[PDB]
Design a protein around this ligand. Structure first.
Ligand code: HEM
Length: 183
């Protein structure tokens, strides 16, 4: 089942409100045709260059950032083009990225909320219609709707009364979330 970690700073917030707020600060990195010419809006994989246990990206509008974790693969120019697929186990949201390929992998200087044990697996055959692709590309483009929908489905799988409209504290009372220090 899904496992959620959240800073106590967000206790009485619902999952939906947090994601809408984080997405508002992250914005859209404009990772679209003809607009990706360098590493300013590509993000990066660990180990990379196009496959890894982590994909991380910082906003070009603020210092908001996220890290997707699992067994991820990006097709780039091969068919189906520009598709992220594979297994997505976690999404960590926060502020300011650190790491790369030295002391280890990627991390967030301030990790606000994370969703783990997602259990998502999208085969390459699904192309951009796969859930993994929609979830991550949505985050890159300022539309966390796909992530919100998947989290909602995973919470309802635990109990039909849970939802992204539930406060993080209610999810902790349900045994699905765990509060971490204000900082
Ligand atoms: C190493 C990281 C990445 C690099 C170097 C990269 C590079 C590129 C480039 C150069 C383009 C432009 C293509 C063009 O002008 O025709 C592009 C487009 C695109 N990329 Fe990436 N990308 C990366 C990661 C990702 C990830 C993780 C996703 C999905 C979650 C993604 C989704 C897309 C999509 C949907 C397009 C639009 C293609 C279209 O509309 O035809 N990219 N990418």
């Amino acid at each position: 089942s899904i496992s959620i970690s959240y800073s106590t700073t967000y206790s009485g917030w619902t999952v939906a409100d947090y994601l809408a707020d984080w997405s508002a600060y992250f914005g859209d990195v404009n990772h679209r045709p003809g607009q990706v010419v360098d590493g300013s809006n590509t993000g990066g994989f660990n180990p990379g260059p196009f496959d890894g246990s982590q994909y991380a990206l910082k906003s070009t509008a603020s210092d908001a950032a996220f890290i997707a974790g699992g067994d991820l693969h990006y097709t780039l120019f091969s068919n189906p083009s520009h598709t992220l697929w594979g297994k997505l186990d976690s999404i960590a949201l926060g502020d300011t990225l650190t790491g790369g390929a030295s002391s280890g992998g990627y991390a967030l200087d301030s990790q606000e909320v994370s969703f783990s044990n997602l259990g998502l697996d999208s085969p390459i055959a699904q192309g951009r219609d796969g859930t993994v692709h929609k979830v991550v590309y949505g985050l890159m483009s300022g539309d966390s709707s796909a992530l919100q929908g998947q989290i909602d489905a995973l919470l309802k799988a635990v109990d039909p009364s849970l939802s992204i409209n539930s406060t993080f504290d209610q999810l902790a009372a349900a045994g699905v979330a765990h509060a971490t220090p204000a900082a």
